[PDB]
Amino acid sequence: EVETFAFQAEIAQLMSLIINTFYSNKEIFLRELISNSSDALDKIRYESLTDPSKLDSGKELHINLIPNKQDRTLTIVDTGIGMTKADLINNLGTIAKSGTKAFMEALQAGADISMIGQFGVGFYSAYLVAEKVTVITKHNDDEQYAWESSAGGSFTVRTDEPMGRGTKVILHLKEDQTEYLEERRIKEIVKKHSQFIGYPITLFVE
Amino acid sequence: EVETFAFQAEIAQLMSLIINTFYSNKEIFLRELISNSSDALDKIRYESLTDPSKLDSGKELHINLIPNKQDRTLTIVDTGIGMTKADLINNLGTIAKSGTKAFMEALQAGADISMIGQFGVGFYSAYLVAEKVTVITKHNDDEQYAWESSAGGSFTVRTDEPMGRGTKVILHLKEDQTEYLEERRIKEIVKKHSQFIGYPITLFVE
Ligand SMILES: Cc1nc(N)nc2c1/C(=N/O)C[C@@H](c1ccc(F)cc1-c1cccnc1)C2
Numbered sequence: 152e153v154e155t156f157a158f159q160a161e162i163a164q165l166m167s168l169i170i171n172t173f174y175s176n177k178e179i180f181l182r183e184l185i186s187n188s189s190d191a192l193d194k195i196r197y198e199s200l201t202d203p204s205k206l207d208s209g210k211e212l213h214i215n216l217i218p219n220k221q222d223r224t225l226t227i228v229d230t231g232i233g234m235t236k237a238d239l240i241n242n243l244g245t246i247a248k249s250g251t252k253a254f255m256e257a258l259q260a261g262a263d264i265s266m267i268g269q270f271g272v273g274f275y276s277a278y279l280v281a282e283k284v285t286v287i288t289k290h291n292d293d294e295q296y297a298w299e300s301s302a303g304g305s306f307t308v309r310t311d312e313p314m315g316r317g318t319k320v321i322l323h324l325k326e327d328q329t330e331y332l333e334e335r336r337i338k339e340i341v342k343k344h345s346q347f348i349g350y351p352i353t354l355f356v357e
Numbered sequence: 358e359v360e361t362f363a364f365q366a367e368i369a370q371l372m373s374l375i376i377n378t379f380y381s382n383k384e385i386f387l388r389e390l391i392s393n394s395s396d397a398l399d400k401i402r403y404e405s406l407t408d409p410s411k412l413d414s415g416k417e418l419h420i421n422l423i424p425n426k427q428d429r430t431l432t433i434v435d436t437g438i439g440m441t442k443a444d445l446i447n448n449l450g451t452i453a454k455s456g457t458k459a460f461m462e463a464l465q466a467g468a469d470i471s472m473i474g475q476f477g478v479g480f481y482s483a484y485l486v487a488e489k490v491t492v493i494t495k496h497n498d499d500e501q502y503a504w505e506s507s508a509g510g511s512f513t514v515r516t517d518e519p520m521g522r523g524t525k526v527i528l529h530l531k532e533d534q535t536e537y538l539e540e541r542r543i544k545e546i547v548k549k550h551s552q553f554i555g556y557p558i559t560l561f562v563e
């Protein structure tokens with residue numbers, strides 16, 4: 152069974168802004184998802200210091216970058232905290248509502264799309280380069296879920312191969328955005344923007 | 358009763374680095390503590406979406422900046438998550454160990470003290486401007502604690518006036534660092550470095 156949800160209207164407006172505004176510096180999408188990955192890894196690490204059994208779902212704390220020219224996907228994998236169904240359906244949308252409002256105001260006031268992360272809604276920069284985003288996620292208290300959206304105001308969730316714990320963000324790239332499947336291009340961006348992440352980052356080859 | 362603890366040796370080395378290195382751009386200390394404050398506020402906000410009774414200790418989510426020329430202190434107050442005794446004594450030191458190691462390597466490799474926050478140990482930039490730091494903190498599962506250090510390799514904790522929930526970082530400033538008690542100076546730094554924090558920041562007057 153696949154369940155369909157409407158984004159909060161502010162988030163839909165944000166996604167449309169990201170998709171429709173002329174903004175050539177699209178490469179910052181990768182910095183934002185890696186930083187989301189690091190934050191999630193920080194969280195599970197901290198929680199494990201009081202409840203060590205929280206690492207029973209996997210001890211390695213890392214980030215994989217996986218390009219696939221056949222599928223036209225760039226996948227960012229982490230072994231971080233993951234997201235619950237409540238995260239996916241209620242909680243993250245509640246928080247993204249205010250971040251979106253603050254980012255929107257900042258943009259009218261002369262801020263720049265690259266500053267999206269300062270407002271805690273940098274996941275949505277995924278839509279700079281991707282026509283569809285698929286998110287596979289597994290949290291300790293919960294099942295593995297598959298979340299998906301091509302924007303248009305809605306997303307789907309189904310129970311989801313098994314990943315132990317963590318998040319996989321699958322970017323189905325736009326046809327004119329395939330430079331992001333290229334090794335020297337990804338390497339360049341990681342070096343420029345993600346040089347000091349405190350977890351190992353592996354760029355897979357094809 | 359006052360309990361005395363030794364810092365992990367890496368953290369002591371970090372504090373000494375911050376205190377001893379010639380580095381004129383000391384104003385970044387304020388950006389780091391405000392950002393710590395925002396992160397703590399983000400955390401209690403998120404936790405409240407699944408357990409609303411976590412806001413029984415205070416609903417307001419804000420940051421106060423309080424200068425006092427008589428005491429020679431700058432105090433940064435938040436109503437964020439607070440810290441437990443385990444945080445103060447075991448947990449934060451365990452995490453700061455790796456951040457310190459990574460920051461140290463980065464500095465040898467040509468990084469700059471201002472980048473301290475990318476390594477998750479930006480609290481310690483407090484020692485750029487302060488001879489002593491006192492931290493009053495209250496977390497929901499725990500008592501109110503007073504943490505204190507003038508560096509030198511040790512810190513104290515005692516049970517601590519009652520603050521409901523949150524953290525107060527009290528900077529006892531160095532004699533040559535009193536510009537940070539001045540209104541137009543603090544305003545300047547907040548504008549330059551903290552312009553987009555998603556919680557209200559009130560600069561108290563004297
Ligand atoms: C746990 C986690 N891991 C990774 N890699 N990325 C994110 C998380 C999250 N944990 O709460 C939040 C998630 C997020 C942040 C801000 C935001 F505005 C949206 C999301 C998000 C992402 C996917 C599906 N639905 C919402 C971004």
Ligand SMILES: Cc1nc(N)nc2c1/C(=N/O)C[C@@H](c1ccc(F)cc1-c1cccnc1)C2
Nearest residue numbers: 393394397438439440449453477478480492524
């Ligand atoms: C909850 C909280 N609030 C505020 N304002 N600041 C901090 C927190 C924290 N929550 O875990 C961690 C704290 C911190 C981070 C990194 C770090 F390396 C040290 C500390 C810290 C601070 C005071 C006493 N002992 C340790 C910085």
